[PDB]
Design a protein around this ligand. Structure first.
Ligand code: AGS
Ligand code: AGS
Lengths: 373, 328, 69, 425
């Protein structure tokens, strides 16, 4: 079973049709379509555009077209050298890769007059670059205006994660010009396209993978809050390697495990009884919805445990260590919030995520803490 | 204190807005504009004879000058007065004052090469110790003994611009306009223009004023500025790109918040909201609920106050529009 | 109709009587006839169809028939 | 490497090794394990799948330090060493700058010294070009991911590639790290495949302790009564009473359950007994031994008790006067915030509320002028600046910064209660 479940994890998409429509100008040498892809995170929009360009170059006259990744630049100069990277040559780029006019000068083809179109992968770093109205909106205006005289221009094939980019554009420029209009969206595919990509790559289907209906169950009950079926497939390969370790049963188990310790693994998160005690003490201080300081909750602990004589209370530093433990598992968050008493004062305002009902189970089972509920 | 709030307004898409502004501003008062323009064009030889004495021509009067500015300058003044000198028509240095990216340093770096580089004055380039002002001082000492003819015509659109009006830029342009061989002509929009210049800067400018009112829509100037239309519609595109579970949960939210303009009284309590999103078997607990809620919150797509009211500040009309159009 | 019984299944998912999102079909029977609703539990195929609606609306899933994920 | 010999010298006159010395030597924090057993195998099979099948994945693990996780992944990649990979301990808390990791990477890939830019350029190049698995230890990731997550954005966008010759073994401190600072888009690439590490039970603590004491538990040495040297002239034996070990394990598992803390407190009690035994015989430094419960009792209590009380019971009388006045002000105004000059006024009060008593006379005199009526009439009490500072820097008192020294605020960092108690002794 190993060599399968190992190899299990090692055109194609239906989406390929749509962009193909928006690509008709590129396989007939016309000026390409004004393509500004947006996409919610997880859907693979980066890898979506990457499958696009990969197929487009493995399918095709001289065939040259590139797509560069804009991450560590924060400025519109060294980007276009990365397009000069396609020449495999050496020049003085410093200006011809910096200003829009110099860019137009920079893009008259040389070898055979096979049109070269430009693609910017992960513009959502240039889009998410320095201050908007100063450089990033300025860079967008510059790179985005296609006012060349030869219609064989640098037709941007852009990609942006958060839609706000189109809202940050100049209002006048976007409506009547640029790569903007085809603001194609790629909403999270529950099963209907991504699950079928899964099946089509899994044509060489291992014998007992498991119940396909439980597979689709996993697909839905994840994609509810998920955008990675391949990564859900990876937690599935981990499940089958659990089956191996013990030498789709356990997948509901592992979901109840990893997603929310509140279900059962909170008892692990609060393994020590003093942890549970301090947590219920925080819940008690919640009745005073104030700055849940170390001091507030600590004094509340002191009084409530002098009352309920379960144990001699902990030291200040001890309570510190306990709450830090509680924060390491993340069951309760803290933040060094600012109060204005003397100066900018930074004290731990905490917020618990647990509910007294999710305390009902986890406490009523331990009758020793119940003296404090 | 029930005030008319711009929220309760008929919003207009950017396309309809742009297009109707186009129709109006290109057809509203055409015949008046052209009559006014053909009438005032007769003043152009008057401007010729006035600028013969280098009197910096400032232009006021309502309506945009930008169009008319480039019109008078590029087309009439420059080449005619160039021919009149006795050959490249004198480079028209247009200052996009409305553009807030103008800076004295670089524009003077241009100016320098525009002006006479008779000596290697680049040798006088130094540390940040501003050679703009010192070098322009030297340039003035030079021109004090040079012949009198315009060697460059600079024109500023909206001299009250967000950059030029900076007092440093203003003083630089003053000491510049002291030069005789240059013709200074500009315009503003700020009604408080005279607040800009003391008798020192006036002496530098020797401003002569002229009214020009043609009642333009300020096309380019409308571009750089921005108002609230330039939120409900912000979230309207967000919800167009989400997951079906988010669609359904926001559908339930919008029903229970629109049942009772979408006011705060009409919302729902998170207790009963969890009761519902658990009854119809959507939310497993409060943590996942608040998680799939903050995706709306982390873009400010719904309001919450206190009961535990989650109230959509978006209008009843726009809300039921979401229902009938994008949700159902 | 199915709304209220779905709410009852919700408050019975609140407790760990299912111990899971999964639940025996035996628990199914224990929680259709033994509860308040009498004859509101439809014919075999009909309440199975109700459960299939609840599946297609992502409220209850089917797997390992003796239980249901 | 080159300088390693430069630390080795010859003059060593047979350093004496006593019993507890050997104990602590094997009890060192450096030298199969019981506590993390199924985790060992789980991560082992994760990396086995990722490498033996020549794929690339992201093994996220989180939990408080001291849970063995650094040792555990090391054990896994050590048994894997015997069966392609570059164990690159990229510790964000070891990186001088945040970006420095790159260079290490940028070195371990080719052995070049350029900037982080070309570093990541060639890195991603290798990750998407090289035709065909190198375990990079992202120790204490937090430091690297603090500025704008761009670092981790890169560090995982690299991983997401399919043919990327890049396995990552990331370890963070808390579980929710990817869901509080990392981008949602980043969080997705991080994935849900993260293994959590719980605390340690006192059972596991006993296990690890006896493990460290395997070859030495209750064992015999050959100790010369003259020099105190031990060899694993009487053949003595030693017992490490597992009841004290029990109680230490219980106490540590209570609040924290950390291997480091437990090991260290055991070492502490050991060396305490060691110094007592040395003193009882005076061997200097050139029948049967045990470790009573009382030793570990002391060594453990010393890891909890503070000193602020036992400190403030020793400050100068001026300091105690200052503190007691401050407490009177705290309860009189109910503000727990006083003004410095106001405290001076209160000290004047407290000195004068008592009568013209000759003893109050002496106090007034000295506290206002060290005798020597020749020089007298001080506005604020003697050493007042000095004692104020001696408090402030000691972290007890906490004061804002205004050059006007009569309206500047003052606050107690310690609890009012413990301070009051200190005044009561
Ligand atoms: N529909 C899909 N088609 C192909 N691969 C997919 C698809 N959905 C997910 N994947 C794969 O799973 C990964 C998860 O998506 P992400 O890379 O995290 O999203 P992305 O590629 O960064 O684009 P986004 O969603 O705008 S962040 C993708 O990169 C692909 O490797
Ligand atoms: N099972 C064990 N057997 C023996 N010694 C152990 C065991 N678990 C922990 N220790 C000791 O306790 C130390 C704990 O180190 P680790 O937990 O591996 O480091 P860590 O958890 O990454 O802490 P960091 O580096 O600050 S995040 C180890 O280095 C050993 O000295």
């Amino acid at each position: 079973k190993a060599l399968l479940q190992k190899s299990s994890e090692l055109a194609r998409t239906a989406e390929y049709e749509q962009v193909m429509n928006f690509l008709a100008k590129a396989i007939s040498e016309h000026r390409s379509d004004s393509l500004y892809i947006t996409g919610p995170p997880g859907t693979g929009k980066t890898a979506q555009l990457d499958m696009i360009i990969r197929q487009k170059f493995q399918s095709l006259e001289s065939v040259a077209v590139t797509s560069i990744n804009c991450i560590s630049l924060g400025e519109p100069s060294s980007i276009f050298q990365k397009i000069f990277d396609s020449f495999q040559d050496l020049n003085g780029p410093t200006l011809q890769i910096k200003n829009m006019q110099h860019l137009q000068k920079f893009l008259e083809p040389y070898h055979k007059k096979t049109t070269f179109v430009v693609v910017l992968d992960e513009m959502d770093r240039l889009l998410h670059a320095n201050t908007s109205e100063t450089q990033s909106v300025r860079t967008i205006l510059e790179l985005f205006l296609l006012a060349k005289l030869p219609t064989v221009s640098f037709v941007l094939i852009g990609m942006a994660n958060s839609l706000d980019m189109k809202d940050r554009f100049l209002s006048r420029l976007n409506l009547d010009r640029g790569l903007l209009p085809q603001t194609i969206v790629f909403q999270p595919y529950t099963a209907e396209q991504m699950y079928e990509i899964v099946i089509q790559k899994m044509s060489s289907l291992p014998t007992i993978i498991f119940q396909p209906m439980a597979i689709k169950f996993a697909a839905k009950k994840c994609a509810g809050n998920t955008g990675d079926l391949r990564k859900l497939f990876d937690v599935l390969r981990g499940s089958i390697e659990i089956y191996e370790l013990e030498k789709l049963n356990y997948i509901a188990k592992v979901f109840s495990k990893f997603v929310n310790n509140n279900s059962t693994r909170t008892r692990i998160a609060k393994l020590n009884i003093q942890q549970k005690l301090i947590l219920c003490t925080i819940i008690q201080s919640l009745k005073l919805n104030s700055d849940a300081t170390i001091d507030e909750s600590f004094d509340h602990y002191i009084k409530a445990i002098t009352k309920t004589d379960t144990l001699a209370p902990l030291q200040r530093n001890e309570f510190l260590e306990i709450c830090t433990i509680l924060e390491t598992c993340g069951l309760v968050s803290i933040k060094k919030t600012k109060c204005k008493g003397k100066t900018k004062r930074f004290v731990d305002k905490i917020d618990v995520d647990l509910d007294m009902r999710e305390f009902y189970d986890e406490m009523t089972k331990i009758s020793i803490l119940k003296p404090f509920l | 204190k029930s005030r008319h709030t711009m929220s309760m307004a008929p919003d207009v898409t950017r396309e309809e807005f742009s297009l109707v502004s186009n129709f109006f501003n290109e057809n509203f008062q055409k015949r008046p504009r052209q009559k006014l323009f053909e009438i005032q064009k007769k003043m152009f030889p008057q401007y010729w004879f006035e600028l013969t004495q280098g009197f910096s021509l400032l232009f006021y009067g309502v309506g945009s000058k930008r169009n008319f500015l480039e019109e008078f300058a590029i087309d009439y003044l420059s080449p005619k007065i160039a021919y009149s000198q006795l050959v490249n028509s004198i480079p028209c240095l247009i200052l996009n004052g409305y553009n807030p990216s103008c800076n004295y340093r670089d524009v003077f770096k241009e100016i320098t090469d525009l002006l006479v580089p008779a000596e290697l004055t680049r040798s006088e380039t130094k540390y940040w110790g501003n050679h703009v002002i010192l070098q322009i001082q030297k340039m003035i000492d030079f021109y004090k003994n040079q012949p009198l003819d315009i060697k460059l015509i600079l024109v500023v659109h909206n001299l009250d611009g967000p950059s030029i009006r900076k007092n440093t830029f203003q003083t630089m342009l003053s000491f510049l306009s002291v030069i005789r061989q240059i013709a200074i002509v500009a315009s503003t929009d700020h009604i408080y223009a005279p607040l800009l210049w003391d008798n020192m800067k006036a002496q530098n400018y020797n401003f002569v004023f002229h009214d020009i009112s043609n009642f333009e829509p300020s096309t380019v100037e409308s571009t750089f500025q921005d108002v609230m239309k330039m939120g409900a519609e912000g979230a309207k595109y967000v919800l167009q790109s989400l997951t079906v579970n988010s669609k359904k949960m926001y559908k339930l939210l919008i029903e229970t918040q629109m049942q009772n303009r979408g006011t705060q009284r009409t919302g729902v309590e998170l207790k009963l909201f969890n009761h519902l999103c658990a009854a119809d078997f959507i939310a497993s607990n409060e943590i996942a609920l608040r998680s799939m809620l903050r995706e709306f919150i982390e873009h400010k797509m719904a309001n919450i106050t206190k009961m535990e009211i989650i109230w959509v500040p978006y209008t009843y009309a726009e809300l039921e529009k979401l229902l009938k159009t994008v949700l159902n | 109709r199915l709304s209220l019984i779905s709410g009852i299944i919700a408050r019975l998912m609140q407790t760990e009587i299912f111990e899971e999102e999964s639940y025996p079909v035996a628990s199914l029977f224990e929680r259709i006839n033994e509860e308040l609703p009498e004859e509101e539990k439809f014919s075999a195929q009909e309440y199975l169809a109700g459960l299939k609606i609840m599946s297609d609306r992502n409220n209850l899933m089917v797997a390992d028939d003796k239980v249901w994920r | 490497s080159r300088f390693e010999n430069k630390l080795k010298t010859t003059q060593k006159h047979q350093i004496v090794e006593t019993i507890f010395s050997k104990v602590k030597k094997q009890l060192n924090s450096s030298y199969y394990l019981p506590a993390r057993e199924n985790e060992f195998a789980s991560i082992y099979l994760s990396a086995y799948s990722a490498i033996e099948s020549d794929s690339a994945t992201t093994i996220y693990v989180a939990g408080t330090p001291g849970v063995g996780k650094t040792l555990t992944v090391r054990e896994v990649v050590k048994e894997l060493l015997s069966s392609d990979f570059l164990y690159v301990e990229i510790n964000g808390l070891k990186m001088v700058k945040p970006t420095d990791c790159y260079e290490t990477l940028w070195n371990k890939v080719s052995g070049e010294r350029l900037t982080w830019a070309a570093s990541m350029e060639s890195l991603e190049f290798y990750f998407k070009r090289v035709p065909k698995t190198i375990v990079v230890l992202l120790d204490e990731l937090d430091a690297m991911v603090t500025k704008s997550q761009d670092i981790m954005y890169n560090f995982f966008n690299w991983t997401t590639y399919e043919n990327a010759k890049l396995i990552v073994i990331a370890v963070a401190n808390t579980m929710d790290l990817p869901e509080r600072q990392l981008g949602n888009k980043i969080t997705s690439r991080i994935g849900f495949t993260r293994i959590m590490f719980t605390g340690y039970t006192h059972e596991e603590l006993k296990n690890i302790i006896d493990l460290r004491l395997k070859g030495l538990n209750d064992s015999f040495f050959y100790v010369d009564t003259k020099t105190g040297n031990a060899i694993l002239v009487r053949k003595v034996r030693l017992r490490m009473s597992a009841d004290a070990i029990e109680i230490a394990s219980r106490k540590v598992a209570s609040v924290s359950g950390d291997a480091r803390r437990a090991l260290k407190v055991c070492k502490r009690a050991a060396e305490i007994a060691e110094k007592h035994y040395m003193a009882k015989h005076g061997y200097g430094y050139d029948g049967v031994q045990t470790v009573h419960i009382t030793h570990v009792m002391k060594a453990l209590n010393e890891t909890l008790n503070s000193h602020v009380i036992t400190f403030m019971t020793r400050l100068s009388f001026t300091a105690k006067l200052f503190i007691y006045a401050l407490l009177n002000l705290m309860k009189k105004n109910g503000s727990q915030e006083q003004e410095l000059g106001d405290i001076v006024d209160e000290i004047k009060l407290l000195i004068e509320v008592n009568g013209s008593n000759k003893f109050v006379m002496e106090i007034a005199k000295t506290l206002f002028q060290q005798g020597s009526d020749n020089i007298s009439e001080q506005l604020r009490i003697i050493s007042w600046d000095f004692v104020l500072n001696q408090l402030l820097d000691a972290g007890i008192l906490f004061k804002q910064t205004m050059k006007n020294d009569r309206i500047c605020c003052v606050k107690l960092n310690i609890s009012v209660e413990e301070a009051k108690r200190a005044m009561n002794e």
